[PDB]
Amino acid sequence: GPHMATGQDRVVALVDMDCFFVQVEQRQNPHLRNKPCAVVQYKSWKGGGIIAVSYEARAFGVTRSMWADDAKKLCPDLLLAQVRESRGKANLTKYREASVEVMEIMSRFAVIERASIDEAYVDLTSAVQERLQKLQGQPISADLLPSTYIEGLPQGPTVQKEGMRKQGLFQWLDSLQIDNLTSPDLQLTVGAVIVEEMRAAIERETGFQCSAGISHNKVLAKLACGLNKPNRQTLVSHGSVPQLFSQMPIRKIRSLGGKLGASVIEILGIEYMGELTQFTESQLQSHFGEKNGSWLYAMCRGIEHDPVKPRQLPKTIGCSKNFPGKTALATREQVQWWLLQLAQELEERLTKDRNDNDRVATQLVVSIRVQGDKRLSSLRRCCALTRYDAHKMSHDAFTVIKNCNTSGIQTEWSPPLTMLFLCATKFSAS
DNA sequence: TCTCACACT
DNA sequence: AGTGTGAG
Ligand SMILES: Nc1ccn([C@H]2C[C@H](O)[C@@H](COP(=O)(O)NP(=O)(O)OP(=O)(O)O)O2)c(=O)n1
Ligand SMILES: [Mg+2]
Numbered sequence: 001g002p003h004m005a006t007g008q009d010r011v012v013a014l015v016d017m018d019c020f021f022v023q024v025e026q027r028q029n030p031h032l033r034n035k036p037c038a039v040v041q042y043k044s045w046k047g048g049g050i051i052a053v054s055y056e057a058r059a060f061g062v063t064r065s066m067w068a069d070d071a072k073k074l075c076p077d078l079l080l081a082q083v084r085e086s087r088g089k090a091n092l093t094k095y096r097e098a099s100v101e102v103m104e105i106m107s108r109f110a111v112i113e114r115a116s117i118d119e120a121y122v123d124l125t126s127a128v129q130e131r132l133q134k135l136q137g138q139p140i141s142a143d144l145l146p147s148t149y150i151e152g153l154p155q156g157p158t159v160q161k162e163g164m165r166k167q168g169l170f171q172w173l174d175s176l177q178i179d180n181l182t183s184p185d186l187q188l189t190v191g192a193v194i195v196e197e198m199r200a201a202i203e204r205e206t207g208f209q210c211s212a213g214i215s216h217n218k219v220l221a222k223l224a225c226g227l228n229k230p231n232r233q234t235l236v237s238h239g240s241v242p243q244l245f246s247q248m249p250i251r252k253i254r255s256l257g258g259k260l261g262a263s264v265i266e267i268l269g270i271e272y273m274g275e276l277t278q279f280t281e282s283q284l285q286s287h288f289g290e291k292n293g294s295w296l297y298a299m300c301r302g303i304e305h306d307p308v309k310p311r312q313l314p315k316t317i318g319c320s321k322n323f324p325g326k327t328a329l330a331t332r333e334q335v336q337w338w339l340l341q342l343a344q345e346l347e348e349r350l351t352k353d354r355n356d357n358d359r360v361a362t363q364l365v366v367s368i369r370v371q372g373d374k375r376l377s378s379l380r381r382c383c384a385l386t387r388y389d390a391h392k393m394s395h396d397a398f399t400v401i402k403n404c405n406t407s408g409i410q411t412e413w414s415p416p417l418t419m420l421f422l423c424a425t426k427f428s429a430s
Numbered sequence: 431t432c433t434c435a436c437a438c439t
Numbered sequence: 440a441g442t443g444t445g446a447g
């Protein structure tokens with residue numbers, strides 16, 4: 001009763017850019033706007049691999065991971081933009097710079113956790129408290145929430161999309177207790193007001209549209225965000241959780257999309273997140289471990305405590321390239337040339353990073369994959385990163401891996417290399 | 431057929 | 440440390 005925590009202590013949002021790399025290319029090239037289009041990497045093999053898809057193209061069935069030649073069979077008028085290539089490899093600079101534009105705007109509203117190139121969590125608890133004081137128990141107008149869905153509503157005793165959205169929003173607002181500044185539902189609603197303002201600022205100042213989720217924790221905010229993408233935001237209240245989870249496949253929850261989620265389904269013989277409530281915490285810890293078990297017990301009730309970490313910048317800066325099939329690297333000079341290419345990109349990124357962000361990397365991680373190996377990495381080794389110098393980095397990288405060459409013949413390399421990866425890690429202030 | 435964070439040991 | 444999972 002009075003002592004059962006409900007996980008309603010924070011207001012957390014997740015903002016995720018819509019078809020992000022496509023919007024970056026559409027802003028640059030107006031001819032791609034409002035068209036079925038996709039962003040591809042590496043044009044020579046089957047037209048390139050698609051990594052992002054506009055919503056117009058998604059209507060034709062175009063998806064990420066399709067070859068463009070194959071996407072063209074579904075959507076013959078599909079337009080394409082190519083990722084820049086530098087030093088023989090895809091170069092993601094344009095998208096990293098565009099990400100910084102967005103993350104800097106979000107940071108004006110609250111400390112953010114950068115979760116990926118195109119999304120960030122926000123802890124809005126303090127901002128909401130501030131705004132509630134300013135509001136002075138005065139009602140929240142639907143006009144302040146023009147792109148907000150309230151998950152689960154309308155419900156109870158119109159056939160158009162926007163009509164339903166308004167109907168649900170009206171039911172929600174009509175039920176709100178605005179004279180109680182500690183009401184979690186009211187706190188979420190003020191959170192949604194702030195997120196409308198944030199999303200409007202991002203669109204005004206960059207041209208990019210995004211979606212967002214507002215709830216009491218990161219997992220629910222992420223789940224919420226995807227419910228009404230694109231260009232809308234979704235509020236998932238604590239009360240909405242039982243119905244929402246009652247038919248929600250386990251794999252849809254962040255961190256349960258892989259082997260762990262598959263094991264939950266298999267071991268327990270369930271399908272939906274809500275079905276987890278029937279197990280004791282000890283039962284869950286017995287199957288999935290102390291940490292996962294406690295997390296699952298709380299999460300299936302809508303409760304999660306993972307903090308929004310104050311981190312706006314990536315913790316590592318890495319450069320990698322695959323050399324699949326018959327392209328695997330088989331000579332010393334080949335391996336040395338490509339390590340050098342990677343090291344040169346890394347140096348460029350590291351130097352820019354040190355000037356912008358007042359920090360230096362101190363460890364260089366080198367990873368390879370040898371042909372035949374079914375693992376994503378064969379060998380991983382680290383060494384000291386003492387100077388931002390590509391020739392030194394590439395020579396050092398070769399040293400920590402040169403004993404992998406099982407060829408007595410010095411010039412040849414065996415087994416051939418199907419992947420090289422260099423990553424700068426362990427940053428210190430500078 | 432290119433990235434980045436984090437748990438385990 | 441090095442290996443692996445999970446995700447954008
Ligand atoms: N496997 C992946 C997933 C994403 N990305 C890139 C391209 C995406 O535009 C960008 C953001 O990923 P995303 O949020 O999963 N999808 P995207 O923003 O394109 O579409 P939405 O579904 O969010 O509207 O990361 C990638 O290069 N490889
Ligand atoms: Mg996105």
Ligand SMILES: [Mg+2]
Binds near residue numbers: 016017116119
């Ligand atoms: Mg995303």
